[PDB]
Design an enzyme around this catalytic site. Structure first.
Site, PDB file in Angstrom:
ATOM      1  N   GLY A  41      -3.330  -0.144   7.484  1.00 28.10           N
ATOM      2  CA  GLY A  41      -4.095  -0.860   8.480  1.00 28.10           C
ATOM      3  C   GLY A  41      -4.236  -0.068   9.758  1.00 28.10           C
ATOM      4  N   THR A  61       0.289   1.965  -3.085  1.00 25.94           N
ATOM      5  CA  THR A  61       0.795   0.661  -2.683  1.00 25.94           C
ATOM      6  C   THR A  61      -0.294  -0.227  -2.093  1.00 25.94           C
ATOM      7  OG1 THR A  61       1.468   1.492  -0.521  1.00 25.94           O
ATOM      8  CG2 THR A  61       3.069   1.638  -2.311  1.00 25.94           C
ATOM      9  N   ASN A 101       3.388  10.435  -0.475  1.00 29.25           N
ATOM     10  CA  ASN A 101       4.667   9.823  -0.825  1.00 29.25           C
ATOM     11  C   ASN A 101       5.162  10.312  -2.176  1.00 29.25           C
ATOM     12  OD1 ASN A 101       3.478   6.799   0.687  1.00 29.25           O
ATOM     13  ND2 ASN A 101       4.885   8.317   1.549  1.00 29.25           N
ATOM     14  N   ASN A 121      11.583   9.351   4.459  1.00 31.21           N
ATOM     15  CA  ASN A 121      11.374   9.550   5.886  1.00 31.21           C
ATOM     16  C   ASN A 121      12.358  10.519   6.518  1.00 31.21           C
ATOM     17  OD1 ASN A 121       9.686   7.486   5.201  1.00 31.21           O
ATOM     18  ND2 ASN A 121      10.551   5.974   6.614  1.00 31.21           N
ATOM     19  N   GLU A 143       1.564  27.763  20.178  1.00 33.37           N
ATOM     20  CA  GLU A 143       1.604  28.906  19.272  1.00 33.37           C
ATOM     21  C   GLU A 143       1.174  28.505  17.868  1.00 33.37           C
ATOM     22  OE1 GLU A 143       2.394  32.090  19.880  1.00 33.37           O
ATOM     23  OE2 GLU A 143       3.006  31.853  21.973  1.00 33.37           O
TER      24      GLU A 143
HETATM   25  N1  GTP Z   1       6.110   8.235   4.999  1.00 34.09           N
HETATM   26  C1  GTP Z   1       6.182   6.922   4.828  1.00 34.09           C
HETATM   27  N2  GTP Z   1       5.045   6.224   4.488  1.00 34.09           N
HETATM   28  C2  GTP Z   1       5.098   4.886   4.309  1.00 34.09           C
HETATM   29  C3  GTP Z   1       6.286   4.205   4.481  1.00 34.09           C
HETATM   30  N3  GTP Z   1       6.050   2.898   4.253  1.00 34.09           N
HETATM   31  C4  GTP Z   1       4.744   2.738   3.947  1.00 34.09           C
HETATM   32  N4  GTP Z   1       4.142   3.964   3.977  1.00 34.09           N
HETATM   33  C5  GTP Z   1       2.722   4.241   3.720  1.00 34.09           C
HETATM   34  O1  GTP Z   1       1.959   3.452   4.611  1.00 34.09           O
HETATM   35  C6  GTP Z   1       0.935   2.754   3.941  1.00 34.09           C
HETATM   36  C7  GTP Z   1       0.824   1.353   4.523  1.00 34.09           C
HETATM   37  O2  GTP Z   1       1.561   1.312   5.721  1.00 34.09           O
HETATM   38  P1  GTP Z   1       0.795   1.107   7.115  1.00 34.09           P
HETATM   39  O3  GTP Z   1      -0.380   2.046   7.225  1.00 34.09           O
HETATM   40  O4  GTP Z   1       1.770   1.347   8.240  1.00 34.09           O
HETATM   41  O5  GTP Z   1       0.336  -0.435   7.065  1.00 34.09           O
HETATM   42  P2  GTP Z   1       0.282  -1.361   8.382  1.00 34.09           P
HETATM   43  O6  GTP Z   1       0.200  -0.550   9.650  1.00 34.09           O
HETATM   44  O7  GTP Z   1       1.489  -2.264   8.393  1.00 34.09           O
HETATM   45  O8  GTP Z   1      -1.073  -2.207   8.197  1.00 34.09           O
HETATM   46  P3  GTP Z   1      -1.184  -3.758   8.615  1.00 34.09           P
HETATM   47  O9  GTP Z   1      -0.039  -4.576   8.066  1.00 34.09           O
HETATM   48  O10 GTP Z   1      -2.478  -4.315   8.077  1.00 34.09           O
HETATM   49  O11 GTP Z   1      -1.189  -3.832  10.124  1.00 34.09           O
HETATM   50  C8  GTP Z   1       1.326   2.723   2.479  1.00 34.09           C
HETATM   51  O12 GTP Z   1       0.204   2.979   1.669  1.00 34.09           O
HETATM   52  C9  GTP Z   1       2.338   3.832   2.312  1.00 34.09           C
HETATM   53  O13 GTP Z   1       1.737   4.919   1.651  1.00 34.09           O
HETATM   54  C10 GTP Z   1       7.433   4.900   4.824  1.00 34.09           C
HETATM   55  O14 GTP Z   1       8.494   4.300   4.972  1.00 34.09           O
HETATM   56  N5  GTP Z   1       7.380   6.264   4.998  1.00 34.09           N
END
Ligand code: GTP
Ligand code: GTP
Ligand code: MG
Ligand code: MG
Lengths: 156, 107, 440, 36, 440
Positions: free
Chosen positions: C144, C179, C206, C228, C254
């Site tokens: 989102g 996801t 991921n 993470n 750099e």
């Molecule tokens: N690197 C990393 N990526 C994550 C993690 N958790 C979720 N993601 C990625 O983030 C995506 C969704 O997370 P967000 O983009 O933060 O979703 P959001 O901001 O909560 O969106 P809304 O709930 O609609 O506001 C997923 O498709 C995952 O691929 C995490 O713990 N580490």
């Protein structure tokens, strides 16, 4: 010392091991308190009115009442570490010479005040007026006490 | 009403609140309204209640559990301690045109 | 030493920032209360915190960061977590309604409700900074606000702060595992701002991280926390020379001119070499060559795109620990003489080596065994174009039937922008295949 | 180097020891729920 | 020997009085018995108390105040409160039969029956004085015993006491929240009483501080007691050079020769910079640069006005606490670069500073935290004319069809006075857009 004030050249402890007190040649009269668990010290600048002075000697009472200063102006500043305020200024008239460079508070309410000329003076608290004067050669830099205080050794 | 068999009968490691066995008019100063008493989690002690458990229930408290069991004493030698900003610039004295004065013992 | 703030947006970005700021405060010495147990007087004052921390006077060191997520669940767990005294409450900006995995209510509808408060709070950090180098913005391309609100930030930070090295640490969605269902849409509609005012877009999916944790790190069933912790050690070599001394100190400015050949091409990868677990850490010797070799290997990479079916164009190699320069330039020599690792003709030079003197600090409870000589590689290859192409196929399939569009257009977004992001990706893919022909 | 790497195993043991101690009770829990 | 007399007239003025006199007693070390114990005495005397108090031999310091309101309930709370032995029994002038909201009640009926009593006790208080430098006035701009009753005092103090700085601290009706239905009406009828029979007039709204303690102090759902303390801190900053010691003491006639450009343009603004809460105070640096910047933000103005919709004509920065005078000039230089604060053609300098050497004192049980550094920004802008114009519009609607007039013309006056008071407002506005034009 603060960034508005200058630099400090003196330290003393108290009758409880948490207080640590510094004066300055630029007026940083600050009563700190020790905070072992968080490993930090906490200062408190002592208000003295508009009397910014230059002071080079500290002595405290034996019952942790009041700390005593010897300034360059020739003025014994007595202030409170428990209300962080002044208590009594020095000789109104006939002030000392080149600034008081040694103070040693006795077990009584008295104090052996020195000078930059050698005018070792035993005076009481309220007037800071001389009682018995003897002129030493050289500026007084150290007033020790042989324990009980009957034989105090003065260095110049 | 679950009377909650002691300790090892919950997913949360707790016996539960004993509960209430008058409502004072209070104009307090931390929360929006009077009918949302836990709006910004004031009164909720979820971190302290998660420090009595072995394993926390949220999958976000795992960041920072074993922080008080250090495995490595930190080698604080190869740092970036600022010396040009702290040894060049003096605070305030103008000492250069001041007399040596009281206590100027020289090497 | 200079400063850089870190704007974490998204559930992903602040959970990456949870593992990042845990590592950050451990490296310098800040406890979760926010205070350093040794004072600046004791230590010959070590202003290594200044890149990510700021003193208040009572020793209360401060994360130079702004956590933002428009939904209030993942930000309230850091106002109630163990790191609740460390952060500032005004820094932790949150909203009421979700972005609901929708670009339109991240940029146009819901995102405008908090774009004022964050831009004020970026100003608060930027004013007290004296040497602000870069914006280290953490997000994910597949959700989102991490797809939404970050695009409105990228436009606003460029008009306000101009040239201040708008870096971007990002999470790409994976080839097979996903996801979300609407993920192809909000992953190419936000890359407009990515190929716009953002100078170096670091990439991680991921899926590759799970494979590293299984093979090298020897844990089955990995969770999102171990994924993470790897990202946190990636920053800690990128911001190591800004915090700790080294042989070849390498600044954040750099990085750009040593990795972006052309203004469109600004998408690097990331790879941490000596990433092995403790039981197989007594086992390997781990001097310098095997880790220079490690980043250059397929099954150590952090993005599912193989560098062998592509040509390198720029590769800065950042080293930490007990790294000796002769051991590097021999390892540079032996890997520049391998046929499968191909470098394009307009880069005769090769690598940008960065040597640092601080070994990586291990997170207690973390997987990664300590290594006294580490590598964090930031490559730049044409092989990332297959990573852009797999979601291009997936987007083109579920857009030709006009599926999942009435959630988008009915939320303050025009239909025309969808076709604009379509032609925009074709241009970038045409650019990457263009920059990698050998002119002869 | 051999020092805290030896410690690192013992932490990894303690994580898995108590994770097992966690899951054994959940087995005992879902049993007692089924037992009633 | 630099005295000021506070004349708290009306409901709000006494309510502000109970908060300001709570603060003044703390600063100068006065207990509610009116006594100063020996422990909180700088050795000998201090002389920093006679500006607001006066010794009466035995050791009792009495306030130099006159509390008058035309009903007992508020004043009787003062007579039966904790400060019953602080305020002298004759300086609590009361009378019965409240001036239920009506300017006519102030200036016809229940006003002339008490005005000879109040000016006598002002005469007695200003005969004990040696260095009387101003008349602080605390009225309400909405009510009967507010705008109405102070209309008698300032039109009788000006003819009696002649040349004295009449500083007003009052409560102006807010843009959208208002208690009485007669409030816009009774604010323009007192403009023939504050434009000529006064020197300065510190405008304060109600809605503004409601937002101040909602976004900084986090005291959503507040009451008047919280608001009157923050207004009480403003006066304590303005009248701080007259009592304490510092680097640039800005005396009251020092203040007004630098603030008031033209004889009729004398309505300034006000901001207190450290309005930070308790838990957020530790979570800030609170240096001079950002507190000076926190005065100019459009969300901390004490009157609901956008300052960016007008032009800052004259400014004055009264710093209270440990402030070195270098960093103020650095803070001034920043606000000379930012475009959004446009000043005027006719004032190149536009900045007065005051450096006091006393930190702010906290009320024991209050909201403002221990900050050792404050500044109060008082700005004469052309942007206050829209606050004038907004209540003009509320007047013209309820004027046009003659309504709530029979209560007002009934207890003694003429219908004509409406138009000339409105014309005086129109002439008050006509100057404000005039002064804010660039000249060729
Ligand atoms: N690197 C990393 N990526 C994550 C993690 N958790 C979720 N993601 C990625 O983030 C995506 C969704 O997370 P967000 O983009 O933060 O979703 P959001 O901001 O909560 O969106 P809304 O709930 O609609 O506001 C997923 O498709 C995952 O691929 C995490 O713990 N580490
Ligand atoms: N900030 C603040 N504003 C107040 C306070 N009391 C009153 N006001 C405002 O002042 C306006 C005028 O009301 P009053 O203070 O009663 O004015 P007044 O002349 O005393 O009215 P009467 O007693 O009926 O003659 C109200 O609408 C309030 O908005 C106060 O204690 N604090
Ligand atoms: Mg979310
Ligand atoms: Mg009243």
């Amino acid at each position: 010392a603060g960034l508005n004030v200058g630099n400090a050249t003196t330290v003393i402890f108290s009758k409880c091991r948490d207080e640590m007190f510094v004066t300055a040649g630029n007026g940083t009269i600050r009563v700190w308190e020790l905070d072992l668990p968080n490993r930090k010290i906490w200062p408190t600048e002592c208000q003295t009115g508009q009397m910014k002075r230059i002071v080079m000697s500290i002595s405290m009472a034996n019952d942790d009442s009041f700390f005593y200063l010897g300034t360059t102006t020739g003025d014994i500043l007595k202030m409170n570490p428990r209300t962080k305020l002044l208590a009594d200024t020095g000789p109104a008239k006939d002030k000392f010479s080149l600034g008081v460079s040694a103070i040693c508070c006795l077990k009584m309410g008295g104090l052996l005040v020195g000078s930059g000329d050698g005018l070792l003076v035993f005076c009481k608290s309220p007037s800071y007026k001389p009682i018995k004067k003897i002129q030493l050669q050289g500026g007084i830099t150290s007033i020790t006490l042989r324990g009980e205080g009957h034989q105090f050794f003065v260095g110049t | 009403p679950r009377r909650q068999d002691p300790k090892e009968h919950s997913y949360y490691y707790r016996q539960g609140w004993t509960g209430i066995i008058k409502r004072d008019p209070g104009y307090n100063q931390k929360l929006h309204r009077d009918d949302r008493e836990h709006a910004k989690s004031l009164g909720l002690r979820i971190n302290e209640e998660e420090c009595e458990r072995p394993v926390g229930v949220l999958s976000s408290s795992v960041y920072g559990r074993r922080i008080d069991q250090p495995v490595e004493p930190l080698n604080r030698d190869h740092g970036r301690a600022g010396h040009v900003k702290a040894d060049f610039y003096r605070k305030n004295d103008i000492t250069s045109i001041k007399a040596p004065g009281f206590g100027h013992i020289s090497p | 030493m200079r400063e850089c703030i870190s704007v974490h947006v998204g559930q992903a970005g602040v959970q990456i920032g949870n593992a990042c700021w845990e590592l950050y405060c451990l490296e310098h010495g800040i406890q979760p209360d926010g205070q350093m147990p040794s004072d600046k007087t004791i230590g010959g004052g070590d202003d290594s915190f200044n890149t990510f921390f700021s003193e208040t006077g009572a020793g209360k060191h401060v994360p130079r960061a702004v956590f933002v997520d428009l939904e209030p669940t993942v930000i309230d767990e850091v106002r109630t977590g163990t790191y609740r005294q460390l952060f500032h409450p005004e820094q932790l900006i949150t909203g009421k309604e979700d972005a609901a995995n929708n670009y339109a209510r991240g940029h146009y509808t819901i995102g405008k409700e908090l774009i004022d408060l964050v831009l004020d709070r970026i100003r608060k950090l930027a004013d007290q900074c004296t040497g602000l180098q870069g914006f280290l913005i953490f997000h994910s391309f597949g959700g989102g606000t991490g797809s939404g609100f970050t695009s409105l930030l990228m436009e606003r930070l460029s008009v306000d702060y101009g040239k201040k090295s708008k870096l971007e640490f990002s999470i790409y969605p994976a080839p097979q595992v996903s996801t979300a269902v609407v993920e192809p849409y909000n992953s190419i509609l936000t890359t407009h701002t990515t190929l716009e005012h953002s100078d170096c877009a670091f990439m991680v999916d991921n899926e590759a991280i799970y494979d590293i944790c299984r093979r090298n790190l020897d844990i089955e069933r990995p969770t999102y926390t171990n994924l993470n912790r790897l990202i946190g050690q990636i920053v800690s070599s990128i911001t190591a020379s800004l915090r700790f001394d080294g042989a070849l100190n390498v600044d954040l400015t750099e990085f750009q001119t040593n990795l972006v050949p052309y203004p469109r091409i600004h998408f690097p990868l990331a790879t941490y070499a000596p990433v092995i677990s403790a039981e197989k850490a007594y086992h390997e010797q781990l001097s310098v060559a095997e880790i220079t070799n490690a980043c250059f290997e397929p099954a150590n990479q952090m993005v599912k795109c193989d560098p062998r079916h592509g040509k390198y164009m720029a590769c800065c190699l950042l080293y930490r620990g007990d790294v000796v320069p002769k051991d590097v330039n021999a390892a540079i020599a032996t890997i520049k003489t391998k046929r499968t690792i191909q470098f394009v003709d307009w880069c005769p030079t090769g690598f940008k080596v960065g040597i640092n003197y601080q070994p990586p600090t291990v997170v207690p409870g973390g997987d990664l065994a300590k290594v006294q000589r580490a590598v964090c590689m930031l490559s730049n290859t044409t092989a990332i174009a297959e990573a852009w192409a797999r979601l291009d196929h997936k987007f083109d399939l579920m857009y030709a039937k006009r599926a999942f569009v009435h959630w988008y257009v009915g939320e303050g977004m025009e239909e025309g922008e969808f076709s604009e992001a379509r032609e925009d990706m074709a241009a970038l893919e045409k650019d990457y295949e263009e920059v990698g022909m050998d002119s002869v | 180097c051999h020092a805290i790497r030896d410690a690192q195993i013992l932490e990894k043991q303690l994580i898995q020891k108590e994770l097992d101690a966690e899951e054994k009770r959940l087995d005992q829990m879902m049993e007692v729920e089924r037992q009633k």
